[PDB]
Design an enzyme around this catalytic site. Sequence first.
Site, PDB file in Angstrom:
ATOM      1  N   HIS A  71       6.818 -13.697  15.159  1.00 15.27           N
ATOM      2  CA  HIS A  71       6.353 -13.584  13.926  1.00 15.27           C
ATOM      3  C   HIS A  71       4.974 -12.672  14.364  1.00 15.27           C
ATOM      4  CE1 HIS A  71       3.699 -17.185  16.570  1.00 15.27           C
ATOM      5  NE2 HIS A  71       3.105 -16.576  16.141  1.00 15.27           N
ATOM      6  N   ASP A  95      11.520 -18.240  17.827  1.00 14.98           N
ATOM      7  CA  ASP A  95      10.654 -17.384  17.193  1.00 14.98           C
ATOM      8  C   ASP A  95       9.810 -16.853  18.048  1.00 14.98           C
ATOM      9  OD1 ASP A  95       7.060 -17.688  16.330  1.00 14.98           O
ATOM     10  OD2 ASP A  95       8.275 -16.543  16.010  1.00 14.98           O
ATOM     11  N   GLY A 151      -4.505 -15.361  18.439  1.00 19.42           N
ATOM     12  CA  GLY A 151      -4.041 -14.105  19.151  1.00 19.42           C
ATOM     13  C   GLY A 151      -3.220 -14.836  21.108  1.00 19.42           C
ATOM     14  N   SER A 153      -0.629 -16.045  20.938  1.00 19.14           N
ATOM     15  CA  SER A 153       1.003 -16.448  20.360  1.00 19.14           C
ATOM     16  C   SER A 153       1.667 -15.697  21.666  1.00 19.14           C
ATOM     17  CB  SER A 153       1.353 -16.305  19.089  1.00 19.14           C
ATOM     18  OG  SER A 153       1.029 -17.277  18.443  1.00 19.14           O
TER      19      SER A 153
END
EC number: 3.4.22.-
Length: 645
Positions: A71, A95, A151, A153
């Site tokens: 993502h 993901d 931020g 991730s």
Amino acid sequence: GSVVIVGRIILSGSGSITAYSQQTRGLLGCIITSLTGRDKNQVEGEVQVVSTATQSFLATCVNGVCWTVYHGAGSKTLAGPKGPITQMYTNVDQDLVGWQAPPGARSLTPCTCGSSDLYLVTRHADVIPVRRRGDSRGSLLSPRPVSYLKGSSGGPLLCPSGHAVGIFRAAVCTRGVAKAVDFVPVESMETTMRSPVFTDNSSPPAVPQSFQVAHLHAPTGSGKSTKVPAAYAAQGYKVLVLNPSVAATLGFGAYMSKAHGIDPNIRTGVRTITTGAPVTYSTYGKFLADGGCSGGAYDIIICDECHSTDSTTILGIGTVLDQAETAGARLVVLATATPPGSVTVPHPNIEEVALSNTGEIPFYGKAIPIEAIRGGRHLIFCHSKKKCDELAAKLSGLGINAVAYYRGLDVSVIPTIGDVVVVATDALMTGYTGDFDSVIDCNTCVTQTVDFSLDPTFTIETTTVPQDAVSRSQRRGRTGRGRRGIYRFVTPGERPSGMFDSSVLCECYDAGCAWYELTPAETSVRLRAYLNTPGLPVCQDHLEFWESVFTGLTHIDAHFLSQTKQAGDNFPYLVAYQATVCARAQAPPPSWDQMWKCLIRLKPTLHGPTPLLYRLGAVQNEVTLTHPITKYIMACMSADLEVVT
Ligand SMILES: [Zn+2]
């Protein structure tokens, strides 16, 4: 452009787990490096801070692969010492993407101790305690505003020994407060690394003995919609083909009659024909209107254009996936040229010319040379109807045959012969099948996104955004069909494909209620089947939440709903429901925008504040929050809601 390493988070190798950042390049270096894809910087450590042009997040090296979230990175390359590094792994379902780690990077290794006491490392080099609760979930010891995790991730979850347990991907929130985290477990990464890097899904699946779902990934023009079902039928099978476009569907029918000598059944709102043939072409919309899968009717169901993320297609495919086996089917084929994670590549027939500022016609900040659309037939994609109407006018008075096409207009306004410039929204894609001498692309799309805004409930926002790879290849494909074509564009890149917003799930419940006589519980069953199926577009799992909302919206006014349905705009159920609550309170709608036109005739009798249920646009009237349905929806907002960071 490439993803670029702009810093690292250094982790302690002994004692308690602590962390600190090292910033290695600034804004200018990042942008330059993104463009060249060539990064000569020394790389150190295992947790990298990475950036694109617009976003920043983390990437973590585990077992020699630098891992991060799809993502965030999409299918982008990573800037490396010898040029751009292509992804070795791209798993949209999980993901998670991976690049072979550039020289110098150190790797974390998987945890062997099985501890439930975890530590999440953030982009600010915070080390946050998390209690593991399942394979891919953990609870924060101290809940924090979700902004705190933004931020992060791609950052690691570590066990007390500093080994990798997984990679952070999303926060589970209660009213904007993160109480838990969702992460990709390390064993999924280990499995990925044991598995093939290359796969092929280009050949039509064989029909198995018992029910299977299969994927068909094959180029536009390869016959997925025509050649493939005709072959299955020639083999003795009964085949249903579902497609999001009425025009395409009607077209397959004519093509099969005159080519393979069979007159297929055709099922669309405008035209339904029963021939008794073993092939049936239907839209997803008409299939849903028909009640889904008829028992014993088909051996094979082909969900054509299965990458499509309109609510009708998603609800239709979820319906097939939930019902097909019980209905006696042996095979479901999920067919598309552009599956999740796919990127647009050059096409032999199509020359792509960036627009410049040199040109007589202003277009999205650039210009179109009048000489480029003077002779012939051309297609110009604009983001909106209003923009189509304007640009058309700047052509009917400037001396050219030009027509606008968009939702609500009849397809016959487009001439099939004679010189023309067609100016259209994406509504063209499902309303008209023909091709053009050239395509000019604004490279932007209108999209809807849900914001859980708590003011009082949720907001559905409409914004214009850069196109994704599916949009780019589909718009570009309207030229260069069998003969030489020209594609002119305003911007070069594309956003990553295969993801869709929670607002689309909202739309599915709305259509279930408005059009298909589905209880929200029934809608959830179908959407669960879709979400449970690998290889399809992905979305946050907000099913229980949306189900709860629509479950409370009872006793809608049948007349208002009939009107919003016919008007054809989005969210007819939510609109008619807000109108119902207003009318019954003799209160005005949120505004007198055309969205609320079913109330216009009542205008002289409506007064006081709007009992506001949710926000679907600008609210100009004063509002009250006392209505029981408002209170009900507010209560719904307390559900666990997983959101990406
Ligand atoms: Zn461990």
